[PDB]
Amino acid sequence: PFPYEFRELNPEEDKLVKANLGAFPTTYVKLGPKGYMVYRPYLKDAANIYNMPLRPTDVFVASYQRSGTTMTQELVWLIENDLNFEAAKTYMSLRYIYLDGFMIYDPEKQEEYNDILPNPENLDMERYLGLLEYSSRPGSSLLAAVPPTEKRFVKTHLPLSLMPPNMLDTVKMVYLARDPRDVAVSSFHHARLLYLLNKQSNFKDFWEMFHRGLYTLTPYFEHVKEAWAKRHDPNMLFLFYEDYLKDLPGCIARIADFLGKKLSEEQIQRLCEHLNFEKFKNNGAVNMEDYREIGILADGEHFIRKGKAGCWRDYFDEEMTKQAEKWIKDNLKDTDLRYPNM
Numbered sequence: 057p058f059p060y061e062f063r064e065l066n067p068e069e070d071k072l073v074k075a076n077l078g079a080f081p082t083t084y085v086k087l088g089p090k091g092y093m094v095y096r097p098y099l100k101d102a103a104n105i106y107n108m109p110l111r112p113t114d115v116f117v118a119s120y121q122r123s124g125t126t127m128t129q130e131l132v133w134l135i136e137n138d139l140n141f142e143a144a145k146t147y148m149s150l151r152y153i154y155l156d157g158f159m160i161y162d163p164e165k166q167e168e169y170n171d172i173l174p175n176p177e178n179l180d181m182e183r184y185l186g187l188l189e190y191s192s193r194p195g196s197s198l199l200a201a202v203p204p205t206e207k208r209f210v211k212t213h214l215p216l217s218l219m220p221p222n223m224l225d226t227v228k229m230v231y232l233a234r235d236p237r238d239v240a241v242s243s244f245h246h247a248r249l250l251y252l253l254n255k256q257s258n259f260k261d262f263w264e265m266f267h268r269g270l271y272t273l274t275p276y277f278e279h280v281k282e283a284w285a286k287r288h289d290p291n292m293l294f295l296f297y298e299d300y301l302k303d304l305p306g307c308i309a310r311i312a313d314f315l316g317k318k319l320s321e322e323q324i325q326r327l328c329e330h331l332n333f334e335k336f337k338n339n340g341a342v343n344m345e346d347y348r349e350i351g352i353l354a355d356g357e358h359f360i361r362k363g364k365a366g367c368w369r370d371y372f373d374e375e376m377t378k379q380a381e382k383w384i385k386d387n388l389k390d391t392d393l394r395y396p397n398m
């Protein structure tokens with residue numbers, strides 16, 4: 057029984073959002089006592105996702121967006137599949153079901169989406185429309201459709217409270233967290249990539265929205281805390297994006313043990329080299345560049361962008377920096393949550 061009610065954004069909230077994301081067709085609504093920002097179309101499948109039947113062989117990769125999900129998905133898939141790199145050449149989007157991907161699309165507004173493009177005429181309509189149709193399918197139906205004899209790999213940015221309670225009694229999950237400031241910068245660019253932001257909007261406007269819990273799937277800390285509280289569970293592996301950059305081999309090992317898979321030092325070094333930023337970046341199976349031919353990606357933006365930690369310093373001025381510290385200190389008060397890089 058779905059125990060959550062949703063509410064429209066009040067004038068003040070709606071004002072800050074409609075000033076940065078207004079041009080984009082899909083709208084938001086606050087969900088649950090924590091007021092998680094979810095695209096309106098989410099509500100048609102929220103209860104189903106809360107009650108989604110789960111299987112013991114299911115493996116989830118969850119995170120607040122732009123925290124290292126893609127890397128993790130690749131590592132997790134190769135490790136669960138005997139490091140069959142050849143097979144890993146298929147599109148990541150075909151190897152994983154994006155549970156909450158559908159929500160960004162509202163069929164009722166199909167005509168309004170191509171208008172966010174500089175040249176709506178240069179679209180590969182056949183693929184564009186095929187994209188809209190798949191996205192019209194609730195996430196739960198996608199999972200349910202996968203045959204039992206096929207291991208299900210699920211990607212999601214949904215906080216644990218919107219998914220089946222005790223889901224961890226059945227499935228394994230790897231949750232990624234990353235310094236909120238770099239997440240904001242990466243989320244800013246990602247919004248630019250898909251034409252989600254008003255062109256006349258800048259990063260500071262994006263930051264105001266993001267740290268105030270007015271961007272997609274925030275409040276950021278409530279999302280992280282829910283997973284952090286469950287890190288003790290044997291079926292949960294909480295990792296930090298920063299650690300991937302400090303010692304990927306060590307991280308690869310942690311993920312292998314968690315998945316009950318043993319790897320030789322050679323196998324690990326091979327996985328590490330496979331995730332080298334430049335190689336990974338030009339890896340068409342994961343860089344989503346297959347969508348550029350369609351016309352829905354903005355020039356000068358990429359799914360796999362920089363790959364560094366600490367670049368937020370190039371985007372936050374003195375004030376923003378101070379504002380961010382207060383926000384982080386307040387949310388880390390009375391909790392053992394700590395970020396490796398901070």
Ligand SMILES: Nc1ncnc2c1ncn2[C@@H]1O[C@H](COP(=O)(O)O)[C@@H](OP(=O)(O)O)[C@H]1O
Nearest residue numbers: 122123124125126242331333336360361362363
């Ligand atoms: N092999 C890799 N090594 C390091 N960072 C990587 C990577 N592949 C992707 N990333 C980074 O991970 C972030 C994407 O997160 P997610 O997959 O959850 O959406 C991006 O951050 P940046 O925008 O800072 O570059 C992206 O460039």
Ligand SMILES: CC1=C(/C=C/C(C)=C/C=C/C(C)=C/CO)C(C)(C)CCC1
Nearest residue numbers: 121160161169187188191250251347352
């Ligand atoms: C279907 C569709 C769109 C494309 C969405 C895409 C390509 C989403 C993939 C997102 C990822 C991979 C990031 C989260 O992890 C856009 C927004 C153009 C507008 C309308 C309908």
Ligand SMILES: [Ca+2]
Nearest residue numbers: 167168170171
């Ligand atoms: Ca139109």
Ligand SMILES: [Hg+2]
Nearest residue numbers: 299303306307
């Ligand atoms: Hg590590």
Ligand SMILES: [Hg+2]
Nearest residue numbers: 325327328329
């Ligand atoms: Hg390496």
Ligand SMILES: [Hg+2]
Nearest residue numbers: 364366367370
């Ligand atoms: Hg930098």
